[PDB]
Amino acid sequence: TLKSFTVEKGIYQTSNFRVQPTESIVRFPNITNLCPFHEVFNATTFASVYAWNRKRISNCVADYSVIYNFAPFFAFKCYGVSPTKLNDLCFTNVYADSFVIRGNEVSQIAPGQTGNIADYNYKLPDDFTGCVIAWNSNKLDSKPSGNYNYLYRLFRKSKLKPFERDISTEIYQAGNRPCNGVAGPNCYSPLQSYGFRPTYGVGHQPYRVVVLSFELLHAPATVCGPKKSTNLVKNKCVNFNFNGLTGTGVLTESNKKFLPFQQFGRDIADTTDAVRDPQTLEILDITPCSFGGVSVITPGTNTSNQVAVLYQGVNCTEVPVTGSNVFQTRAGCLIGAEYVNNSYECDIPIGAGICASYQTQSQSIIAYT
Amino acid sequence: AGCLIGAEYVNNSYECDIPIGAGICASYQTQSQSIIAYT
Amino acid sequence: TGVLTESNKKFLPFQQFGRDIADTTDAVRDPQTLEILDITPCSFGGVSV
Amino acid sequence: QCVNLITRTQSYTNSFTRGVYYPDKVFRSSVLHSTQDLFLPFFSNVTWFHAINPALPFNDGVYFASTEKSNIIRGWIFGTTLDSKTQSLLIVNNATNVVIKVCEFQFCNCTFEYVSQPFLMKNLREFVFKNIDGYFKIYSKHTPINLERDLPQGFSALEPLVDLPIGINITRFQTLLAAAYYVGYLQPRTFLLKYNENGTITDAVDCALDPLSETKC
Amino acid sequence: ALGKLQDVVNHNAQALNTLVKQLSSKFGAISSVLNDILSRLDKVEAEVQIDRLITGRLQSLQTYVTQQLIRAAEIRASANLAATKMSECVLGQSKRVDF
Amino acid sequence: ALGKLQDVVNHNAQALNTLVKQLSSKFGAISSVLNDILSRLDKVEAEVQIDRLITGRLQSLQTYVTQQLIRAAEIRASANLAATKMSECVLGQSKRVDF
Amino acid sequence: STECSNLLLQYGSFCTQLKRALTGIAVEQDKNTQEVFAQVKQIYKTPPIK
Amino acid sequence: STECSNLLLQYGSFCTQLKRALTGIAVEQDKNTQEVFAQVKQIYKTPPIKYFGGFNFSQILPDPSKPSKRSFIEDLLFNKVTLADAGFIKQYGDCLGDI
Amino acid sequence: AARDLICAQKFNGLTVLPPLLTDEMIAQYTSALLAGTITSGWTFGAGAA
Ligand SMILES: *[C@@H]1O[C@H](CO)[C@@H](O[C@@H]2O[C@H](CO)[C@@H](O)[C@H](O)[C@H]2NC(C)=O)[C@H](O)[C@H]1NC(C)=O
Ligand SMILES: *[C@@H]1O[C@H](CO)[C@@H](O)[C@H](O)[C@H]1NC(C)=O
Ligand SMILES: *[C@@H]1O[C@H](CO)[C@@H](O)[C@H](O)[C@H]1NC(C)=O
Ligand SMILES: *[C@@H]1O[C@H](CO)[C@@H](O)[C@H](O)[C@H]1NC(C)=O
Ligand SMILES: *[C@@H]1O[C@H](CO)[C@@H](O)[C@H](O)[C@H]1NC(C)=O
Ligand SMILES: *[C@@H]1O[C@H](CO)[C@@H](O)[C@H](O)[C@H]1NC(C)=O
Ligand SMILES: *[C@@H]1O[C@H](CO)[C@@H](O)[C@H](O)[C@H]1NC(C)=O
C-alpha cells in the first residue's frame, strides 16, 4: 500500500475486509406454462400497419432462443435490454405487435423517430424497452400482378401518441371546402395500398415486423424464463436472485407493513431494502454482509517486524479470526497488542484515549490509556 | 434590491431582523399581526 | 424565444447575422425584407421569499 | 332507449387538499419524496353535479367523487363518441364482476375483455382515472365520512386497484345512474409526499400553490 | 448562543447526507442501480453505463473532498485563534483592546 | 496606492467575464448553440451533444465556485485582520511593534 | 430549453450545493463588513466648536 | 461488483489522493484539539478548602459525583448542543438490529 | 452601439446582489468612531465615552 520496502512507525490504513457469500439462491414464480411465440411468428397473413394486432403474453415460461428457428432474420434489435440476457431477467407482461411495412420504413420503427409510419400508423415511446424484429417477405407477401391487400395512412389531422391505433376511414379535408363523404378535388381517401411486386428493388420489398414490448417490474411477475428455483435460506450471507433482481446479502424476516400491491422496497440511496418472495407471500429484509476497515500498527521496519491489527468499527465477536491477544476499544477492536494497566505518553495513536507502543515486557507491542 | 410585495413600509428604524438589501430589513410585528419593511 | 425590436445597427450588405461574446445571436436579418432586428431575451429575474 | 336524464344541475365547490394517490408500487417509510405526475391541484375548483347528461370532457385525467350512502351509483362510461363506430370503454358493475369492453353496447372490431372482484360493499368514494401511453389506470379509496355536506378536511391517499391495457383514445365520459357527484381535472404537477413509519402517505405539499409551499419544496 | 458548534455539527451531517443521496442519480445512464445494469445488458453496453456511473460518483466524491478541505482550513484558523486566546487570556493578562 | 481594492474589483470582474466566455466552447459537440443542436438532430442523436454541453458547463461552474470559495477565505482573513486593527489601533493605544 | 432541463435533472444535486456555497459566501461578506465597521454601539457626533 | 472495480482501476490514483486528503484532515483535527487544550504540563488540582476571598467558583469547578467530572456550566453546554453519536460504539452492531 | 458585458452577464444567469450596509451607513460608522476617539479617547471603547 505504501509502495515501499521500508515502513516507518505508526498506524496505516490498509484494504478493507469483507465476508464472502456461501451459496447462491434463486427465487422465481411457480409457473409451468409455455409462451406461444410460435403462433405469433408463424401466421398465414399479417395485418396492415394501420390495423396492427397486439397479442398479450403472460403467465408462461418464455424461451427467447427458439425465435431464431421460427423466422429468418439477421439481428434482434433491442432497446434497453440485450438479446443474450433475456433468458435470465424477467418481466410482468409481454406484448407482441405484428405488421408489414416497406423496406425504407424499417428505420422508422425506433424510439424518437418520425416520418410517415411513425406519425400516422405506428408510434413507439421514447422510453421504449423491447426488441424489434424485421425480415424480408418478398416470397410470401408479394404477387406478380401486385399485392394490394396491405394499406397505410397518409393523411391525419394530428400526429399519433405512442401505442395508438386508427381504424376509421373518413375522407380527409385538405381545404376549406367540406367533403361530406365525397372525394372531390380537395378531398382524398386517407388509406392507400402498398404496391408489392417481386421485380422491385430491395428498398421497396415488403418486410414483416414483429415488435416485442416489455413491462420491466411493477406488477407481480408472470413471464419468467426457464431458470430453476432454490430453497430459501435466512440469516446467512448469500447471493440472491429475486425475479432478475440479483445481489449479495443477508435475508431475514421483517416487520415491514407492505401494502398488498407493493412488491419492492427502496432506500434513500435507491437500493433494495426489502423484497417479497414470489412463491410464498412473505417479506424479507436485505442487509449487506459484515465489513469494516483494517488498520496496521507497526514500529519501524528497521526496529522489528512485529505488527498489530485494528479492525475499526467492528466488535471482535463479529471478527472471524492475527495474534493471541484480543482487546476491545471504542475505535474498533485490537488484535496482537496486549493491554497494560500503566499509562505512558502517546507513541502511536489508536483513538478514544487508547495509544500503542513497542517496548520490552522480551520486546512486544502493548496498548494503554 | 428590487420589488417587495406583501410587506408595507414604515417610517421607523429598528434593528435588522431579516436582511433584504441596501439598508432595508423586514420584520413581523403586532402594532394586527403583519410583516413590515423598514430602514 | 425573445422580443424582436427594430434596430439601428449598421449591418453591412454582405452581413446577415450579429453575434455576442457568449456565442449567441444579438441581431438577425429578415429573409423577406431588408430589415435588421434586435433579439433580446424576455423579462426574467429571481424570486426570494 | 328514451331520454330520462332529468336535466343536469351544476354547482361549484372546493377540493380541500384531496385527490392524492400512490405514484408507484414501491414501499417507502420515513422519507419525503418528490414526484412529478398528473395530480389534482390543492384548493382547486371542482364541479358538483346533481340529478334528483351531455358529454363531459376528459382533460388529462379525471378525479371522481361520490358521497352516496343510498348506493344508486354503479358505473362509468368512457370513450370519444357513444355509438358503434369509435372505440369506447364500458365499465359496468353487476355487484359481482366488472365487465370492460371496447366496441359498443348501443347505450340503452373488438379488442379487449376483462372481469374482476367487486369494488364496493356515511361513506366517500374517490376515484382517479388516468390515460397514459395506451394504458388506463384506476385509483380508488373509501372513507368513513362525517359532517355530510362537502368534501372533508384531511388526507386520504388513493391506493390503486386496477391497471388496464386498453390502448384507445379517451376525450369524453359519462356516468351510469338523489345522484350527486364531484368532478375535477388533473394537471401536471410536482408534489412533495410524506411517508410515515408504516409506509402510509400522510401529508403532501403542492409546489405551485403559493410561495410558502414553493419554499417548502 | 451555541450556533457555531451547532453549525459545525450540521455541516458535517449535511455533506454526508448529500453524498448518500447523490447515489440515486443516473448521470445519463439507463439506471442508477448497478446490478440492474449488469443484468439487463451484455458486456460492452454495461461497461459504457458503468463508466458513466463511475465518472459521476467520482466527481461527486471529489467535490465532497474539496469542500472538506476548505472547511478544515477554516476550522484550523479558528483553532489557532482559540489557542492564542488560551495562551493570552487564561495564562496571562492582556492589554489588547477587545481581545 | 489603492491597488488591493482595485485587485478585489478586477478579480471578480474577470471571473464573471471568463464564466460568460466559457459558453462559447463546444466541449467536443458539433455546436455550442443548444437550439442548433436541437434543430439539426433528432432526439437520440442530440441527447449526446446536449449531455456533452451539460458536462462542460457544469465543470466550468464547479471551477468558478471553488475559486470563489478560496478567495472568500482570503477576504475573510483580511477582514479579521482589519477588525483586529480597528479594535486595537483605533479604540486604544498599541504597544505591539509595527502592528 | 425543456429537453436540457430534463437531462439536467439526472445529475442530482450539483446545482443546489453550488447555490448553497454562493449563498454562504454572500452572507459571509455582510458578516465581514458588520464585524469590521459596526464596532461602536452609539453614533457619537462632534461639537460645533472645532 | 468485480466489473465496476476492474473499470475503476483504469482511472489512476484518484482514490489514493482522496484518502490521503481525508487522513490529513483527520490528523489535523486531533492536532488542533491538542494544541488548544494541552497547554499545561502538570495536572493541577484545587485544595479541599474552598475559600478564595469571597469568590465562589462552584459553577466552573468539577462535580466529583458524576462519572464524567464536568462542571455545571460544562454539563449545560454539553446538553444544549445536540451532538450526534456519529456511529462510535459499533455502528454495524446497531445496524444489525431488526428495526 | 458599445455593447456592455454586464448585460451579457445578466442574460446568462449571473446576477450581483447589493450589500446590506450602504456607503452612507459605513460613513456614519466611521464618523461615529472618529468623533468618539477625538472627543473621548480610548474610554468609549471600554464603555461610556
Ligand atoms: C456558590 O454557588 C453555589 C451554587 O450557586 C451555592 O450553593 C447553593 O446555595 C443555596 C443557598 O445559598 C442553596 O439553596 C443551593 O441548594 C446551593 N446549591 C446549588 C446547586 O444551587 C453556594 O451557596 C455559593 N457559595 C456561597 C458562599 O454562597
Ligand atoms: C409454488 O410453490 C409455492 C411454494 O411452495 C407454493 O406456495 C405455491 O402454491 C406453488 N404454486 C402452485 C401452483 O402449486
Ligand atoms: C408454420 O406451421 C406449419 C404447420 O403448423 C409448418 O408446416 C410451417 O413449416 C411453419 N412455418 C412457416 C414459416 O410457415
Ligand atoms: C460486542 O458484542 C457483545 C456480545 O455480543 C455485546 O454484548 C456488546 O454489546 C457488543 N458491543 C460492545 C461495544 O462491546
Ligand atoms: C369556481 O368557478 C366559478 C366560476 O364563476 C366561481 O363562481 C366559483 O366561485 C369558483 N369556486 C371557488 C373559487 O372556490
Ligand atoms: C385522440 O385524442 C387526441 C387528444 O389530444 C385528439 O387530438 C385526437 O383528435 C384524437 N384522435 C381520434 C382519432 O379520435
Ligand atoms: C403504525 O402502525 C402501528 C400498528 O399498526 C400503530 O400503533 C402506529 O400508531 C402506526 N403509526 C402511525 C399511524 O403513524
XYZ file of N, CA and C in Angstrom, chain F residues 85 89 95-99:
21
model
N -7.306 45.394 13.825
C -6.682 46.714 13.780
C -7.655 47.824 14.166
N -5.733 49.420 17.247
C -5.066 50.671 16.898
C -5.973 51.885 17.067
N 1.061 48.701 22.098
C 2.485 48.530 22.352
C 3.125 47.498 21.437
N 2.341 46.844 20.582
C 2.880 45.874 19.640
C 3.697 46.582 18.569
N 4.889 46.061 18.297
C 5.826 46.717 17.393
C 5.382 46.487 15.957
N 5.259 47.585 15.201
C 4.905 47.630 13.777
C 3.524 47.049 13.475
N 2.667 46.888 14.486
C 1.301 46.450 14.229
C 0.461 47.577 13.649
